[PDB]
Amino acid sequence: KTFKQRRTFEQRVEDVRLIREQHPTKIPVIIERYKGEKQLPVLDKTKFLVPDHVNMSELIKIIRRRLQLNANQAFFLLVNGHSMVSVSTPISEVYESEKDEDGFLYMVYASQETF
Numbered sequence: 602k603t604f605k606q607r608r609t610f611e612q613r614v615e616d617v618r619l620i621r622e623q624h625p626t627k628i629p630v631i632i633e634r635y636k637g638e639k640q641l642p643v644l645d646k647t648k649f650l651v652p653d654h655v656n657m658s659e660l661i662k663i664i665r666r667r668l669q670l671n672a673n674q675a676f677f678l679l680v681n682g683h684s685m686v687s688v689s690t691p692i693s694e695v696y697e698s699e700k701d702e703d704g705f706l707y708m709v710y711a712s713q714e715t716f
């Protein structure tokens with residue numbers, strides 16, 4: 602079901618090394634629905650190339666636009682398992698501190714704060 606499940610550490614590592622070569626200005630982000638989630642829909646895809654200059658505030662807006670939400674639907678974004686300390690931080694900086702050993706940046710979303 603989940604991304605880590607579907608691809609070997611070996612495969613995930615090699616895809617990250619390719620995105621480096623072919624999309625050097627992009628952050629490799631895995632974005633996944635919380636396995637509990639009742640309200641929000643699933644995304645068309647799992648793996649996104651996010652421009653390295655957008656802050657987390659713009660990445661939340663992007664994904665809310667991808668899910669086509671409206672003003673009073675709720676959306677929470679976890680990064681590498683925990684809450685974001687700050688939405689104002691650039692995704693280049695967030696990558697360097699929050700990346701996985703495979704080289705992706707893992708994110709999970711829900712309508713509840715209690716995942």
Ligand SMILES: CC(C)(C)c1cc(O)ccc1O
Binds near residue numbers: 616619620623
């Ligand atoms: C081919 C390319 C490196 C651009 C790529 C894009 C993507 O969304 C997922 C995997 C990839 O290797």
Ligand SMILES: [Cl-]
Binds near residue numbers: 623624625626627
């Ligand atoms: Cl690029």
